[PDB]
Symmetry: C2
Subunit: 571 residues, 2 copies
Amino acid sequence: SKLKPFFALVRRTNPSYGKLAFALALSVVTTLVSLLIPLLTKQLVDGFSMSNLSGTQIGLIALVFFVQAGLSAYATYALNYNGQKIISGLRELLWKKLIKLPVSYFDTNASGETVSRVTNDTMVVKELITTHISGFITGIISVIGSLTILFIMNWKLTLLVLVVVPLAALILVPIGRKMFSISRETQDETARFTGLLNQILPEIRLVKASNAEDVEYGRGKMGISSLFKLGVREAKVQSLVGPLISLVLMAALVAVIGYGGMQVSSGELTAGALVAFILYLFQIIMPMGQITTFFTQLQKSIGATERMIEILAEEEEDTVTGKQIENAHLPIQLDRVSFGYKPDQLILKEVSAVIEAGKVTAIVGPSGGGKTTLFKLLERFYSPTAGTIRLGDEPVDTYSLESWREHIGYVSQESPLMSGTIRENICYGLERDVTDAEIEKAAEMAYALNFIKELPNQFDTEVGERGIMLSGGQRQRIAIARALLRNPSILMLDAATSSLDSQSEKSVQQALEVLMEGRTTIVIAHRLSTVVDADQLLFVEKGEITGRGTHHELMASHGLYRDFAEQQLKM
Amino acid sequence: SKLKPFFALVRRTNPSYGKLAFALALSVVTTLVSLLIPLLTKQLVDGFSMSNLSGTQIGLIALVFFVQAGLSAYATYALNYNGQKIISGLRELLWKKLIKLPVSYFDTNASGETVSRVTNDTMVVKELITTHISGFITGIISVIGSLTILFIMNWKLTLLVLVVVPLAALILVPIGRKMFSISRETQDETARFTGLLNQILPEIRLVKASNAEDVEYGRGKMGISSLFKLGVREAKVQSLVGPLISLVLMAALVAVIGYGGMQVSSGELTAGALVAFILYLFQIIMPMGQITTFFTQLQKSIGATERMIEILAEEEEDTVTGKQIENAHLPIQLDRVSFGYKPDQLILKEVSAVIEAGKVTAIVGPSGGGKTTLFKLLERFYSPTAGTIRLGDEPVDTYSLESWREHIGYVSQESPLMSGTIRENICYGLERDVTDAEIEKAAEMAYALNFIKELPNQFDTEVGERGIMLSGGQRQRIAIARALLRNPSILMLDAATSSLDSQSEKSVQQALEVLMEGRTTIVIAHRLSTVVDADQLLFVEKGEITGRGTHHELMASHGLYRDFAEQQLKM
């Protein structure tokens, strides 16, 4: 059944089903060659006297090894190469989907867990396909055909003793499991002792100050004594297991080998059959581990595939919405917007607001209310189900979300840089324009080129893999220049105006007030600089609008009664 | 040479020599028995038909096996039991040392590395001693005896073949090493890709703002392409190495046992000898690897051995210093006190100050000032070298430090508590007095019976692993109450007064003041409650005494002014 999802995925990785079959059959004939190997040695033993035909048989055996090696090598290379093509396809599709579609909240599920899933689960799937789909088939064919050749070579003989030996081995194994259990308890208790020590040391200050080194020495002694008793336990078990292991194993080996010798010395027809038997039981034992490993890893592989298809399931979309985009200059309207999170959580309720077009307007929200949610609603990652943010007499959703975000003036103080150089900022500003060679021209025009440390270079200025060797204000003004470059039509502001002085704060304030004056400006912050800057301001509390109007007597009085208490809470 | 420190440490262990000798000789006996084993099988197989007397012979085989197993078991039990005894001795010595002598500075080295040192190095030493000394002697004996009896068995034919086969194995090994290295290069690029994805992920919100989804899709595709490139090389190397490994190993084994069979059909010196040789050959594989293991872990542990003596190296002093402490109510004097963390560092320079008996004391310190080291040397954890700290005309260096230490009391900022219950703190308030059964009544006197009458249980109420069951305020109050009761002479702390408000702050302040109408106090906190409760107010700057005099006028003029007024403005 799970083969259905597994094959669905490998079908999503579409083009190598014939080469894989080639590889599998070549591996099969490889194992058959390995089966052949003993018999030529058997003939060699049969010759036994002269060197000429013995030399010919040596030639044959060397040739057959060489064929086995070459063909097996080709099979393995083909298998792994195809598998790496497969894994390339998997990662390509997965990354494409995972970046393109899934709107913000899904990556809100987790951060490192997703990329971890991708990496490790892809690796497991690939190793599975190539190594284990080889190994299981080759080994099972090997072992069944091998016991068959044993039946042919040996009757109701020294193959029966062989098959009863692992009976005793299975009787053996649980003893090793018990040893493993005691070992587990051992590192468990050692970790306990380590934790006790970790607790004790940092407070050595109070320990000494109390003159209580003696009771602590006693605590250590107790812990050590407990570890000592457990060590004695492990000792007893280890001693009664190990020699028992050696006993049973060596004894069974002696039984097998010496009973074969009993056959050969008796004149039974087993002397080159004996060398065949030893070689060939060797080839028998070699591949059992592969069988067991496949049996184990199948479960994890299938779970991984389930995870993969789960990640592939969900969907999102952006230009698909429409093309009804216009000049995008109209007041933003929130109409009875109640949609928040999952319809059963309901973090929002009927939130309605009117912000005039081309007007600087900020918001104020509580630390733990709905301010961040209203932020993510203005930036419109969430899909309003109950509420409606009115724009353009209801094409607000209808026109391309890509076109709308193409008008967005996104900015935030937290935002570091994408890895690389300064040019990549405007390359991100690319919208099939590339801004030609108006890139540095605009950098100059809007104050950005005046500022990145006298432009050490226009392209070689490496912003950093992470961006450490640059400060916050620098990157924030880089971003504001980027947004001014993109489209200076609709501006949002997280108000990246924090501790960047009174030089850079006013710098970005005039940047938004001059370059972005007539067009729409939206601010979200906590300080009074933004509330006095904005022409209109609204206030949000318990996930509901609780303030409106201009910001002079209105917001002063809004403060005075309750918002002043809120501010005093902030300080 | 290094065996001399090894012997010195295990001599610090002391009682084991004879028992270890017994065990080692027993293991030698066992390995000789193992050598003996297959000769019995050879006698049996050369017996040959006539399973009757074969019964007696195989019974002799069985008894030899049984005595081998039992002797080996006793050997292993003795080895591990003794080794655990040495581990006990080491752990007790390290713990007694570490807790008792090392003054705070040795811990200021750092914390976690020391406990990791302890646990891991003890484990390594145990494993070394017992497993690897036994194994090294066992293996050398086994392999040498094996080669000798193999001489005596087949001479020039079998030994030459056997010796030359590991020659081809050594030919093999470097290719396996190269495969391993390329595999490591493989995980290197996997981690590179992982880090790229990790970096890009919050950059998903950034790019969804920035609309460069195709740009990042491309970035991921180049990353995947690089991984695919490397995978091709990994594939080629794996394909080359694998078949070559199988080739050499299987073909050489063919050579060996087939030459045996060639001889067998040759009617040379054969039959059970083949059966004998086979057993001996396996008698090599179990020992061989152990040699390798011993040849590594030793040096590992020997460094641990060095590490051990290093911790054992440090020495320190206590109550063997002397005894002169009895009223402990004389003014303390700081006379030219000049010693930082190290004489060369000179964090502290000739600081001189006066504190009269019973006077409250408050110390004002900056973040970068030597305020912490000043407090630590008041704790007398920083040994005076040049300067002199003396109350009672320099007995500080004559009487025992711990004596002054019970005569003083301390509580820190965080003020955690010993793992366990209420009994931890109160019983730590014991100095052979045992404080009868008034501990709870005294706690009541010190306003500590609040959480006695909480009473989840008087003694059974347990705080958890660390003590998170309680809160900062209640832990602070219980600890201070108990310790101040325990030590009513000098009184000292860093004022663990916090956001524990006005109820806890005032209550604990008045309680400690009740503890000290006739007792001396000193505080180095960073607020103003203790200073206005203090009659002398002092400041530290650059490891130098400044800002002395009475609180109100003198501090407002100079002490509480200057940088303190500056940071008050910063408040």
